[PDB]
């Protein structure tokens, strides 16, 4: 079965695939996510959507999320991850992104945090992260735009690739180390509680994100 409903979900091994149409009331449209495979090594899935209205509101974040042992960011050694994906229609206003949450309480709900770390592998149509650009950051020898904004109790750092990274390999912990070292991130008192990869559509379509593989571990 496709996952078409707002919070339709599938779990396989340590990967959970969510349609997660959290912003569906902000516009008009539809979106269904298909799971291809999910094992202990990785997952493959796709999502297809069309959205209009609410030009600057995210409509959804269909994603694959990892089940892992939650732990303080200061005790993470590495978060090796790969993401191989493509969009068929790039004439859209959307991002492709990792989404991570941390909190001071390990038992915080997993859909929000004290902090949110996003890693945008792609930006289409000029859509912008939460907040404003505060820096240009070098991480693992690649340059990223670094944005910061806050909404209520949630503070969001977003690292943005200058060109789409359709075959990503990296260590997400490099980004936490960057924030710890350069932006006073409180690593020794924040637990990593969520690690996801997916796409945020604003407008456009029909368009399909095909994720040929996503793999992650928190070690
Ligand atoms: C130095 As700042 C813009 O991260 O307070
Ligand atoms: C040292 As700073 C908190 O202004 O990134
Ligand atoms: Zn239904
Ligand atoms: Zn909170
Ligand atoms: Zn808190
Ligand atoms: Zn707080
Ligand atoms: Zn700072």
UniProtKB/Swiss-Prot annotation:
Entries under Pfam families matching the protein: Glyco_hydro_12
GO MF annotation list: cellulase activity
Key word Disulfide bond present: no
GO annotation (BP), single: cellulose catabolic process
The protein's Enzyme Commission number: 3.2.1.4
Superkingdom classification of source: Eukaryota
Protein's UniProt keywords contain Cell cycle: no
UniProt xrefs under Gene3D superfamilies: 2.60.120.180
Catalytic activity field: Endohydrolysis of (1->4)-beta-D-glucosidic linkages in cellulose, lichenin and cereal beta-D-glucans
GO cellular component, one term: extracellular region
Catalytic EC class: hydrolase
Localisation: Secreted
Keywords for this protein: Carbohydrate metabolism, Cellulose degradation, Glycosidase, Hydrolase, Polysaccharide degradation, Pyrrolidone carboxylic acid, Secreted, Signal
Protein induction: By cellulosic materials and hemicelluloses.
Record InterPro entries: ConA-like_dom_sf, GH11/12, GH12
Family indicated by similarity: Belongs to the glycosyl hydrolase 12 (cellulase H) family.
Alphabetized PANTHER family for the sequence: BLR1656 PROTEIN, PUTATIVE-RELATED
Miscellaneous comment in the UniProt entry for this protein: Will also hydrolyze 1,4-linkages in beta-D-glucans also containing 1,3-linkages.
Protein name: Endoglucanase-1
């Amino acid at each position: 079965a496709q996952l078409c409903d707002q919070y339709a979900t599938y779990t396989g091994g340590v990967y959970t695939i969510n349609n997660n149409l959290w912003g569906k009331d902000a516009g008009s449209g539809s979106q269904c996510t298909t799971v291809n495979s999910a094992s202990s090594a990785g997952t493959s899935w796709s999502t297809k959507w069309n959205w209009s209205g609410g030009e600057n509101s995210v409509k959804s974040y269909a994603n694959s999320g990892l089940t892992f042992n939650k732990k303080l960011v200061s005790q993470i050694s590495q978060i090796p991850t790969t993401a191989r994906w493509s969009y068929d229609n790039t004439g859209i206003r959307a991002d492709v992104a990792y989404d991570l949450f941390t909190a001071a309480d390990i038992n915080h709900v997993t859909w929000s945090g004290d902090y949110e770390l996003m890693i945008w592998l792609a930006r289409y149509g000029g859509v912008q992260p939460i907040g404003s650009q505060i820096a240009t950051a070098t991480v693992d020898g690649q340059t990223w735009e670094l944005w910061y904004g806050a909404n209520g109790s949630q503070k969001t750092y977003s690292f943005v690739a200058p060109t789409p990274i359709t075959s990503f390999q990296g260590d997400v912990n490099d980004f936490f180390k960057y924030l710890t070292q350069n932006h006073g991130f409180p690593a020794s008192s924040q637990y990593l509680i969520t690690l996801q990869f997916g796409t945020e559509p604003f407008t456009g379509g029909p368009a399909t994100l095909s994720v040929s593989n996503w793999s992650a571990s928190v070690q």
